[model samples]
Target chain A: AIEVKLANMEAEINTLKSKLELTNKLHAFSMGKKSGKKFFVTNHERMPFSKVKALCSELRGTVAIPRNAEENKAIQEVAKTSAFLGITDEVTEGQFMYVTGGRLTYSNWKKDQPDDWYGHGLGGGEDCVTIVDNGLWNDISCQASHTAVCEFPA
Target chain B: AIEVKLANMEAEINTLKSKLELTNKLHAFSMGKKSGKKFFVTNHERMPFSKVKALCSELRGTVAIPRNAEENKAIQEVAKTSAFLGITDEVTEGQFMYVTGGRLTYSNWKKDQPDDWYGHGLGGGEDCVTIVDNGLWNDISCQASHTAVCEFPA
Candidate 1:
């Protein structure tokens, strides 16, 4: 009887351990979530817009391009600082499009933003989009370095 | 006997559920480990040195200050890009110190680094420490923004 009881206790412990492991694995993948989307922010390296987009591609994500006000707010809340978005005017000098291959249908450009400020001396005025604090958007030079945010489907 | 068996099974299930909850709580505190020390890299916003230090303090951690070459390399591997460290020279120009109240002992300065480049036009040279992509250290202006790594006891 004593041996049987010990074996039963050991089996119970093993079952508990397996359950715990599964829970931990689930927790690991759910670390950063906003609006049910998985997002990643680049570390402090302020790379050019093109390089930032490439890094997102390598991660199997796209430079985050929020499609509407709700997504814009969600992404901005997760970003917590000014950061580059996937939107750019590379195709046409003044028409911005998301790297995901769509024209921007929604925007939150700050006052006097998208002025296409040409002072960066890059010849082309500001061609990339950045979301500043408070979720307002602004146009910045593409060659200028800034951190980027990437997003993946949930 | 039937009633006793039902009661026993219910008790066992409750025990398993409680154990799983505890395991998930512990997993939340677990982060990347380097040289036996656990550290967390912020994913949200990049902030200046002071703000980063404050955030770590609130979390009961401190901006990571690598103690040796091995620790430095380990932290850099986790950082993967330029990020802020606890070390700063604000106390005395050119005299760097760690936020944990320690003088520098182990050093990994990049070639010709810590030059304290004063060209930020802020009227002061670099006074804060940052780790670059190659795991080497450089001094930067404290006000410049960067993501931070927080260290906790393993």
Candidate 2:
């Protein structure tokens, strides 16, 4: 029998899908979507949106890509939009997430804190974000204080 | 000024022609042909003709190819009968030489040398002599003793 090897793009999507599944389970616990699982917060560092977009594009070609739910209401809400995939306003179950902030784009920078990296001796870059205070809705890179929220899958 | 990279297949052809000149000088010690170089000999054990053809096709696209006087003569003979190239073997120089071959299809297996590779060990495969053996042809796979011929800019 002739054996065929999977292409590079296909291999990467399988890995990404595995990570997404694990994150979903954790997010489910936090949202009280699943019972008997206690919610605990985990700190996630910021990542660049540009890099994230590239990953999404590659995934789109190799894997089953969910369409935007809000923009295209016909699309299923589950795992359809980026926010639904885990980038939500409130911490929900099984959502492994990260952030990005610099200018006024996407999510707003929290009060008094683009902290510009240097303000806190963290060294600033255009896209890299730090949690000024842990919270799903908090500014991505602001130095201002904010509370972090998390949920666990049931 | 910004430097731009160019593929320039014609330019690459010229470079190869120059190298062939040097190779021909060495080949003159044995073969009298102005541009036929001795590549290498191979002994194929058990691979199929179709697989060998696929390998050669891929190698041709990726690397430089070789041809011998016999192959050149074959093409010229065809051109003469068909008037395909509008030129005879007499005006061979300064021409863009292309030496390609397909499967021989018919097998005239030797009575005593049955184990010897004729077309890189590929049964019924056409034996082609490339300029730079690049490890494609073999004896057990082929049915004929083959050498390649080429004609290009002097």
Q: Highest TM-score: which candidate?
A: 1
lDDT of model 2 at position B44? 26
lDDT of 1 by residue, A18-116 (tens): 766555333423344322355554554667888988988997888888788877877777677777898998888889988878787999999998889
- Evaluate candidate 1 by giving its C-alpha RMSD to the native, one decimal: 14.1
Model no. 1, DockQ: 0.07
Instruction: Please provide, for model 2 over A22-140, each residue's C-alpha lDDT reduced to its tens digit, 9 standing for 90 to 100.
Output: 65464444333425533322112122333333333322211111122221221122222212112322232222233221222233334663332334443442223322222112223
lDDT of 2 by residue, B29-132 (tens): 11222223322212222233333344444434211132444443433332222111111111232222222433222222224422332345445433222222
Interface Cα RMSD, each model: 8.4, 30.3
